Design a protein around this ligand. Structure first.
Ligand code: FES
Ligand SMILES: [K+]
Ligand SMILES: [K+]
Ligand SMILES: [Mg+2]
Ligand SMILES: [Mg+2]
Ligand SMILES: [Mg+2]
Ligand SMILES: [Mg+2]
Ligand SMILES: [Mg+2]
Ligand SMILES: [Mg+2]
Ligand SMILES: [Mg+2]
Ligand SMILES: [Mg+2]
Ligand SMILES: [Mg+2]
Ligand SMILES: [Mg+2]
Ligand SMILES: [Mg+2]
Ligand SMILES: [Mg+2]
Ligand SMILES: [Mg+2]
Ligand SMILES: [Mg+2]
Ligand SMILES: [Mg+2]
Ligand SMILES: [Mg+2]
Ligand SMILES: [Mg+2]
Lengths: 23, 128, 74, 142, 118, 97, 86, 48, 137, 72
RNA sequence: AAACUCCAGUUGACACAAAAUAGACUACGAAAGUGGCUUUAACAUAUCUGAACACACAAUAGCUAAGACCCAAACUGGGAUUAGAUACCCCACUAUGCUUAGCCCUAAACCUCAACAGUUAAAUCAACAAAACUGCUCGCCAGAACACUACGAGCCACAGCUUAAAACUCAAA
């Protein structure tokens, strides 16, 4: 199968980790 | 524990074992065997002391005694091997299985349940 | 094919018909086109061998049932 | 079966790779994906058969001493000849001696392949020197 | 249980080799072992060079000691052999003759389907 | 009923199962001659069961025996002991020229 | 290092034919798996990658052996046509 | 039967009294565990 | 007697001789065939160095060192210095699968040396140090 | 069939007869079949041992001129 | 190119690192895992099912403390490439991978197949995967996205983990 759902989750987690890092 | 001079369970009832050379008695004793052989002697000691028929190994009493001997061996193993998670699991599972046996023996034969607790030194506890 | 010659001769001798050759798609289910609108199909098909040369059922077994033709078969 | 498909409907059909079948084959027919596999596997057997014959002392004492090594073996799908590439040695003169021995042996080799009847219908065996070292041999001679 | 001590001794003259064996068998007896037999496999070239006690060895005397001992004697004996300078390499294994070989009917065929399936 | 009808029983013509060359024999780590027959002469590599013809059980015993003999000082690791090069060749492997 | 030298992986040359001796040595090292072993060891193959290739190699060998067996079995009938014309 | 067999073997077991005699009796002897197998499954004992 | 590809075992009584010298007495040509270079050292049976040549010492640089013709040239150079010291027969011990693995041996022959045996000593660890990570290409 | 046990032993002990089977003749009798018929006759005479009933059968055929070459 | 040039080759001595071949085997363990050798201990349950939280475990990465350090190696530094190259390629070296004692409790932790029992006759069956099902039990799910998020609570966790919404939005996903 495709990994498009994982890719959505991947970006959400990256941006969250980066947001937590900044603040 | 039984004395090291104790003969193996298989050679205890052969005729003439008391007249053999001392060397032959050492080779047929617990001293020259692995620990599992000492546990077979312990199990038989508890069976004769507790159960009505020492030769009935399929009764709920015999299983509790057999498992109680295994439980004690795990405790001694873990006294020397405190990071052995495999045997720590076996101990906790064995304690749980015996509690289930004791629960079923208490419900079916209380007089025997009491003799098993006295003989093996088990303090039955009700679950939370 | 070991018995193609034998079977073709037996049919001619008894006054009947033999098909021992490659069976083309639609000989029975499309006979009117292949032979003509007035073609009469067989009233009985006798299979001396029911399998084709790749060890599958002869196509005429299925097609004979489609055309409601009784089949005798070894 | 495996991820590699082996459900062929005509699986029981008798594989008949002969020079005569090609002339009665339908060129209109398009080769199946697994039709190549049957050819590829036969080529592997021809490699193993020639390679084993090469290393046995008795078949030809001349052949065994040479210690010939085959680079590749691809039978022609036409079935006219069994190509048998043989790795070319660096020694320029030794590439001629090995080649000469192979050509003489080749005629007897075909009969010896009939001894293994499964590979009996073998086309004339052809040996090809590996040009990697052989092409340079011609130039350096000139 | 019954054990087999595979003993490789420094290549020495007969008097020193006998003193090493006696000293080694007494160590087994001091630890409670009942020694059953002593076999000489002969002096031979080692399969490779062995360094032991600040020395390099190319030949050794191969000996076997069949004996019975308590399970706690093995650990103590291995320590004793490590300190004897005349022992090149000593290993204690469970005696192979105790383990009984189970009978075999033959080689049962294994289905190829299971091979790729497994 | 009828005397000529077939009767139920086990195959009387059944053949015995195959056995490896070492079936029924003790494999000792001290028997380096036997163990050497299953390692490569040039590299000392243990042969797979497709070369030795052994069954899974004896393939395992031979493997465990070789590894024990090698590290205990009975058997070389990187080559077959030359003393055993003239022993019976029981392995389906052809090497030289 | 601790073993005897000039026994392992050693081939003698016959009649000064060094090319044939080298091919024999290379054939020995290839059959014993040392050549492929040396090459795979130049860079570290990760355990998940080693298992995948070992599993792929074992399934390919079985598939090729099974495809060879089928062709050998089905080549018995490669003889000339006994019933030509029918 | 196992106690009887074992009772006879103990007569030949090494002891502190007979240790020296058995130690010397071993240096003079040789025990060979080597033997080879053939393609027919036959043991080929060593030439000694 | 039939020819044996197996080398004579030291301590046994062989009949093979090379200029009256036994196999154990023949000097050794050590060829290290690396991926980017080839090094050849000829030593006596007593481990006395007699000649050394590599692609780098023969004036090859960078990728030219990792070629067959560079290794062949290194072999000829080592053979010449060894022949002056009295070497005719050599035992070849080659470690590594570099491009100069076979070419280095040819150069030794073209330089006047006779190879009586070939030994591979390419290091193979039996389990050892972790190699560098794979390259992304 | 019960006689299959006798046929398995006969083939093991004496092997297949050097005489060739003629499967075209519907009344063909092989050496094994001749052995089986004699073996059955002697069993009906009251003999019940198996190892003894097999040795006496071989002797009877030798007396009749049959060639029985033991494989081993 | 940089780097090294107390460098390289042969020989000898030499580890608290890692475990060719066997292994084309398919075993052990609850899973995670487990493939050099030896020994000791040792692999629960004589009906099944039974927990995000109880009980005990749980790869890799990571934390705290003390050690080891061959090799590999985030990061970092240097070389090169490039429009740029915080990459891919080359070199060096660190945390880290190891040991000991504590933590942390995650994984595409996946045969992507819940446990147990039974069946091969029915219709074989949306498709693909891995032939199709029955009994029984627990767990779980109810359009997408918001969301492995917010808040609450618990936790040796404090840039964490577990449990886990809503508003706005869409006619798809
Ligand atoms: S076949 Fe019986 S042990 Fe190998
Ligand atoms: K290993
Ligand atoms: K998976
Ligand atoms: Mg998002
Ligand atoms: Mg349960
Ligand atoms: Mg749970
Ligand atoms: Mg719940
Ligand atoms: Mg969780
Ligand atoms: Mg963990
Ligand atoms: Mg850590
Ligand atoms: Mg490094
Ligand atoms: Mg940079
Ligand atoms: Mg570090
Ligand atoms: Mg370690
Ligand atoms: Mg996993
Ligand atoms: Mg469940
Ligand atoms: Mg939703
Ligand atoms: Mg997460
Ligand atoms: Mg969260
Ligand atoms: Mg919170």
């Amino acid at each position: 199968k495709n990994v498009l759902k994982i890719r959505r989750r991947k970006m959400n987690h990256h941006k969250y980790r980066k947001l937590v890092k900044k603040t | 524990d039984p004395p090291p001079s104790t003969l193996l369970k298989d050679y205890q009832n052969v005729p003439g074992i008391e007249k053999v050379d001392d060397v032959v008695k050492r080779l047929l004793s617990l001293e020259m065997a692995n620990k599992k052989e000492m546990l077979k002697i312990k199990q038989e000691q508890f069976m004769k002391k507790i159960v009505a028929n020492p030769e009935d190994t399929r009764s709920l009493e015999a299983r509790i005694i057999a498992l109680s001997v295994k439980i004690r061996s795990y405790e001694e193993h873990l006294e020397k091997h405190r990071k052995d998670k495999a045997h720590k699991r076996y101990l906790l599972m064995s304690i749980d299985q015996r509690k289930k046996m004791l629960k079923n023996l208490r419900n079916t034969n209380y007089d025997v349940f009491e003799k098993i607790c006295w003989g093996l030194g088990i303090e039955y506890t009700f679950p939370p | 094919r070991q018995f193609s010659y034998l079977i073709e001769n037996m049919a001619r001798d008894c006054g009947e018909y033999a098909h021992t050759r490659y069976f083309r798609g639609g000989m029975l289910t499309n006979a009117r086109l292949l032979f003509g609108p007035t073609v009469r199909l067989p009233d009985l098909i006798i299979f001396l061998h029911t399998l084709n040369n790749i060890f599958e059922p002869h196509v005429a077994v299925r097609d004979a049932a489609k055309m409601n033709i009784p089949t005798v078969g070894i | 079966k495996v991820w590699y498909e082996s459900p062929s409907l005509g699986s029981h059909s008798t594989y008949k790779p002969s020079k005569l079948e090609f002339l009665m084959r339908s060129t209109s027919k398009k080769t199946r994906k697994e039709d190549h596999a049957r050819l590829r596997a036969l080529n592997g057997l021809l490699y193993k058969a020639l390679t084993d014959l090469l290393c046995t002392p008795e078949v030809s004492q001349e052949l065994y001493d040479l210690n010939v090594e085959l680079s590749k073996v691809s039978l022609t799908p036409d079935f006219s000849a069994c190509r048998a590439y043989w790795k070319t040695t660096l020694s320029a003169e030794q590439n001629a001696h090995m080649e000469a021995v192979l050509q003489r042996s080749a005629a007897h080799m075909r009969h010896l392949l009939m001894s293994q009847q499964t590979l009996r219908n073998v086309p004339p065996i052809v040996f090809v020197q590996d040009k990697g070292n052989a092409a340079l041999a011609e130039l350096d001679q000139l | 249980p019954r054990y087999e001590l595979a003993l490789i001794l420094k290549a020495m003259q007969r008097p020193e080799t006998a003193a090493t064996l006696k000293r080694t068998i007494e160590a087994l007896m001091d630890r409670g072992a009942i020694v059953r037999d002593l076999e000489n496999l002969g002096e031979r070239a080692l399969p490779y060079r062995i360094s032991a006690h600040s020395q390099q060895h190319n030949r050794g005397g191969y000996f076997l000691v069949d004996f019975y001992a308590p399970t706690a004697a093995v650990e103590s004996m291995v320590e004793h052999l490590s300190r004897d300078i005349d022992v090149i390499r000593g290993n204690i294994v469970k005696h192979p003759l105790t383990q009984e070989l189970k009978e075999c009917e033959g080689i049962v065929p294994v289905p190829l389907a299971e091979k790729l399936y497994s | 009923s009828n005397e000529d009808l077939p009767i139920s029983m086990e195959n009387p013509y059944k053949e015995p199962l195959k056995k490896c060359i070492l079936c029924g024999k003790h494999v000792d780590y001290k028997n380096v001659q036997l163990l050497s027959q299953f390692v490569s002469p040039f590299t000392g590599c243990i042969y797979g069961r497709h070369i030795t013809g052994l069954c899974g059980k004896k393939q395992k015993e031979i493997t465990k025996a070789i590894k024990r003999a090698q590290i205990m000082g009975f058997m070389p690791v990187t080559y077959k002991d030359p003393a055993y090069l003239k022993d019976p060749k029981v392995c389906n492997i052809r090497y030289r020229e | 290092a601790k073993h005897l030298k000039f026994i392992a992986r050693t081939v003698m040359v016959q009649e000064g034919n060094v090319e044939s001796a080298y091919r024999t040595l290379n054939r020995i090292l290839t059959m014993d798996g040392l050549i492929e072993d040396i090459k795979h060891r130049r860079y570290y193959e990760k355990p998940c990658r080693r298992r995948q290739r070992e599993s792929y190699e074992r399934c390919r060998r079985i598939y090729n052996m099974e495809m060879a067996r089928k062709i050998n079995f089905l080549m018995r009938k490669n003889r000339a046509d006994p019933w030509q014309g029918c | 039967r196992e106690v009887l067999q074992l009772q006879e073997e103990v007569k030949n077991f090494i002891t502190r009294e007979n240790l020296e005699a058995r130690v010397e009796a071993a240096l003079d002897s040789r025990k060979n565990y080597n033997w080879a197998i053939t393609r027919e499954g036959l043991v080929v004992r060593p030439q000694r | 007697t039939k020819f044996s590809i197996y080398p004579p075992i030291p301590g046994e009584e062989s009949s093979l001789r090379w200029a009256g010298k036994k196999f154990e007495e023949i000097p050794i040509a050590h060829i290290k065939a690396s991926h980017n270079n080839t090094q050849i050292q000829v030593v006596s049976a007593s481990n006395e160095p007699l000649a050394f040549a590599s692609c780098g010492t023969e004036g090859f640089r960078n990728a030219k060192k990792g070629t067959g013709i560079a290794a062949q040239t290194a072999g000829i150079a080592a053979a010449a210095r060894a022949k002056q010291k009295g070497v005719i027969h050599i035992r070849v011990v080659v470690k590594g699968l570099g491009p100069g693995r076979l070419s280095a041996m040819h150069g030794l022959i073209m330089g006047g040396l006779e190879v009586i045996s070939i030994t591979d000593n390419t290091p193979i660890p039996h389990x050892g140090c972790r190699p560098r990570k794979a390259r992304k290409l | 069939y019960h006689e299959d046990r006798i046929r398995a032993k006969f083939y093991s002990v004496y092997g297949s007869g050097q005489r060739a089977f003629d499967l075209f003749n519907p009344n063909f009798k092989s050496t094994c079949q001749r052995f089986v018929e004699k073996y059955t006759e002697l069993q009906k005479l009251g003999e019940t041992d198996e190892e003894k009933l097999f040795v006496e059968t071989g002797k009877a055929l030798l007396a009749e001129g049959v060639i029985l070459r033991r494989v081993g």
